[PDB]
């Protein structure tokens, strides 16, 4: 089974991803206020955290059932699934960091509240 991620899963994954990727504190500050510059440093951050939460695979791409579970807590599956899938695309520029980001970007645009609430 896949289980949901919380604030202190995120906290852990944030510090691990900052470490391995060597993310400037600069960038970390923006992430904490849900701001995301459109460059590789931010893109690979998102991939890393998604990898650790089991929401994205570098080969397979977005993991749809897990994304819906994460967001829905297995409650409002069908509605959330429809919104999640609108943001699912293929690895068009063979850049896994970009792929994960572009998904996250699509979904944060309209549904950022749900993302924050999925952690809470
Ligand atoms: C389906 C496309 C993805 C939409 C986001 C799904 C949300 C579930 C994942 C849990 C939260 C991580 C979202 C990425 C935010 C970046 C991490 C740092 C955020 C922060 O500092 O609070």
Alpha-carbon distance of 108 to 101, in angstroms, equals 10
CA 36 to chain centroid, in Å, comes to 12
Q: Which two tokens stand for residue 18?
A: 């900052």
Alpha-carbon distance of 30 to 9, in angstroms, equals 19
Question: What was the resolution (in A) of this experimentally determined structure?
Answer: 2.0
Alpha-carbon distance of 39 to 6, in angstroms, equals 26
Q: Which residue of 31, 43, 68 sits with most ligand 1 atoms within 8 Å of its CB, as the best mutation to test the pocket? A: 31
Q: Is 27 annotated as a binding residue?
A: no
Instruction: Find the domain containing 28 and state its range.
Output: 1-120
Helices (H), the chain: 7-21, 25-32, 40-53, 64-72, 77-85, 96-119
Q: How was this structure determined?
A: X-ray
The count of domains in the chain is 1
Alpha-carbon distance of 59 to 120, in angstroms, equals 29
Q: Is 14 annotated as a binding residue?
A: yes
Q: Which two tokens stand for residue 102?
A: 């572009």
Angle among Cα 92, 93, 99 to the nearest 5 degrees reads 75
Q: Which two tokens stand for residue 116?
A: 């924050």
């Amino acid at each position: 089974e896949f289980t949901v991620s919380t604030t202190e899963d995120l906290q852990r994954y944030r510090t691990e991803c900052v470490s391995s990727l060597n993310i400037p504190a600069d960038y970390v500050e923006k992430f904490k206020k849900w701001e995301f510059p459109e460059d590789d440093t931010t893109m690979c951050y998102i991939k890393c955290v998604f990898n650790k939460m089991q929401l994205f695979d570098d080969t397979e791409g977005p993991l749809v059932d897990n994304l819906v579970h994460q967001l829905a807590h297995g409650r409002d599956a069908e509605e959330v699934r429809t919104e999640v899938l609108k943001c699912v695309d293929k690895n068009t520029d063979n850049n896994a960091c970009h792929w994960a980001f572009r998904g996250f970007k699509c979904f944060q645009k309209n549904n950022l509240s749900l993302i924050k609430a999925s952690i809470k």
